[PDB]
């Protein structure tokens, strides 16, 4: 048995928003252990709803839960910027013993957008004189953490050996990425230039160095 | 002679104590089997305490981890009744972790389940000779009364529950005859559940009262005469008989969900459309036990109850309940007397120690002055071996 979660939601704050598992209602006269869990980045999951409509001391009444048919629903209300976080639903049945649902992220929206602080590093003296060539290019204050990473040598596109990481929360809510783009010291200083470009929400910021 | 069986219930208004046999306490010095699930079953000559050991002595180091019910090592003995189930004075029956006894007028009926979870096979005794089996039909742990069952006119029965503890099951009755079964019917029961019954004879039948372990805090029983054509329900008064269950409210006649997940082994006497029911004093806990006399609870919906008797303090623990009759064969009167035993648990999970046991009281209905009172097992816990 999965129970299945939609993959994203987002709302302002003060709307409300409502979550849907569209899993296990199974097995008739078996009752319903159905539970809802929060997770900010890097801590452990927290206990909102279980039981289905049952909330735990200490947990905000603007979660509710609920269930009609197949699916189970998690409403709520008046949207907090601190609500932005992973939602899971879970269910025990007689079947499979508990299934955690694909997961849904709640984004909080109205803030305001930034564009990406790039800067491009040549690759040392010190690293061409062990015969290797690394470009670095780096992305740093933008919002929100989507963005994707192009390299290039005088016009002419490059995918051999790049290297980029994922978009990651700062210590001030905006995203940090970087990029990496290998080359033997033959490739780097036989060309012209070599460029990183960086598009966020369809503004492309660009960078170039040059032996 | 045959137990004929063809009169009505005594009519009872109160409970007089019949037996305590203060096992765990003696069980702290003395050899003393660790066991549970007991129960009383009467002869035309006499009455006995059977009971399910764990095939170890309190206060010993066999007594470890004895919480699961079920082993190789689990057999089904008796003893007088308010004797302690000690191996110098225990008769044995069968092999067994789940176990039904009781007497036809001429010699003991005694029923052994035991084998794997998946195979296991009810031996059958009458005068402690083999003379029937038979085997889990679908495969899911094979259980039984663990109360005595019921005979009537030479036939005994009982009910026997295959399938899941936490669902739909299967459930059958018997009719035995000189430990040879001779009919069974699979009963059409869809979305009752049985488990553990109490069957008492009443005028050439026999009622149960059973325990909803699915979805149930009130308690379902089914009816049945010698051709096994039977009828089944559940108590519809609103007070409720399991243990969990939720307080006092509009009853059902069917099974009710609030607090309907796993419950504890209990009875009932009906008496036209009233009804004796035995159950704990708290609702979460297995702990005190009452006696509530519902004149109109057996077909009637409401809360309301004319009559309560204290058995076990509600602060003290309690177990498992059933019930026992003494026929007129036996006490010379003029109809089959109710009479019930109360299981005392002790130790896991409630406790911390390394075993679980229990002791027995016991009561009989009388139409007489009565009064009501706090008998609990009353060990000190924990014991020497659990340090
Ligand atoms: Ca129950
Ligand atoms: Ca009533």
Redesign the interface.
């Known amino acids: 048995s999965v129970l299945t979660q939609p993959a994203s939601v987002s709302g302002s704050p003060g709307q409300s928003i409502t979550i849907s598992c569209t899993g296990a209602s199974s ?1 008739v ?3 319903n252990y159905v539970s809802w869990y929060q997770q900010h980045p890097g801590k452990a999951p927290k206990l909102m709803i279980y039981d289905v409509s049952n909330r735990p001391s200490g947990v905000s009444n603007r979660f509710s839960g609920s269930k009609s048919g197949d699916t189970a629903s998690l409403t709520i209300s008046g949207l907090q910027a601190e609500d932005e976080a992973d939602y899971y639903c879970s269910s025990y049945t ?1 079947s499979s013993s508990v299934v955690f649902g694909g997961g849904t992220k709640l984004t909080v929206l109205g803030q305001p957008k930034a564009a990406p602080s790039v800067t491009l590093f040549p690759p040392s003296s010190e690293e061409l004189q062990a015969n290797k060539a690394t470009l670095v290019c780096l992305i740093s204050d933008f919002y929100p953490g989507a963005v994707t990473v192009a390299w290039k040598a005088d016009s002419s596109p490059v995918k051999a050996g790049v290297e980029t990481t994922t978009p990651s929360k700062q210590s001030n809510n905006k995203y940090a990425a970087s990029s990496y783009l290998s080359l033997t010291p033959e490739q780097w200083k036989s060309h012209r230039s070599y460029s990183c470009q960086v598009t966020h929400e369809g503004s492309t910021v660009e960078k170039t160095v040059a032996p | 002679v045959k137990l004929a069986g063809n009169s009505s219930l005594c009519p009872v208004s109160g409970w007089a104590i019949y037996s305590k046999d203060n096992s765990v306490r003696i069980g702290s010095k003395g050899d003393v089997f660790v066991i549970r699930e007991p129960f009383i079953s009467c002869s035309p000559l006499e009455c006995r305490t059977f009971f399910l050991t764990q095939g170890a002595l309190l206060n010993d180091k066999h007594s470890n981890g004895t919480i699961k019910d079920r082993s190789p090592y689990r057999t089904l003995m008796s003893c007088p009744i308010g004797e302690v189930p000690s191996p110098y004075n225990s008769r044995f029956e069968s092999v067994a972790w789940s176990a039904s006894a009781c007497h036809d007028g001429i010699n003991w009926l005694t029923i052994g389940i035991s084998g794997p979870d998946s195979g296991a096979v009810a031996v059958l005794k009458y005068n402690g000779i083999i003379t029937d089996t038979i085997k889990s039909w679908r495969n899911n742990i094979l259980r039984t009364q663990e109360s005595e069952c019921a005979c009537v006119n030479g036939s005994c029965f009982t009910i026997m529950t295959d399938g899941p503890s936490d669902g739909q099951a299967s459930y059958k009755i018997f009719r035995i005859e000189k430990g040879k079964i001779v009919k069974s019917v699979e009963m059409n029961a869809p979305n009752y559940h049985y488990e553990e019954c109490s069957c008492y004879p009443d005028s050439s039948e026999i009622t149960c009262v059973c325990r909803d372990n699915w979805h149930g805090s009130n308690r379902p029983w089914v009816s049945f005469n010698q051709n096994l054509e039977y009828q089944i329900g559940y108590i519809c008064s609103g007070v409720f008989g399991d243990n969990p269950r939720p307080n006092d409210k509009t009853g059902s006649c069917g099974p009710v969900s609030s607090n309907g997940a796993n419950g504890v082994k209990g009875f009932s006497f009906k008496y036209g459309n009233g009804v004796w029911i035995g159950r704990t004093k708290s609702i979460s806990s297995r702990k005190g036990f009452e006696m509530i006399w519902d004149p109109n609870g057996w077909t009637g919906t409401d809360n309301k109850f004319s009559i309560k008797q204290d058995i076990v303090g509600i602060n003290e623990w309690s177990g498992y309940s059933g019930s026992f009759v003494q026929h007129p064969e036996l006490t010379g009167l003029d109809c089959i007397r109710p009479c019930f035993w109360v299981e005392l648990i002790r130790g896991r999970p409630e406790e911390n120690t390394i075993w679980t046991s229990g002791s027995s009281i016991s009561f009989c209905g009388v139409n007489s002055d009565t009064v009501g009172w706090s008998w609990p097992d009353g060990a000190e816990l924990p014991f020497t071996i659990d340090k």
């Open positions: 097995d006269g078996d009752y007689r």
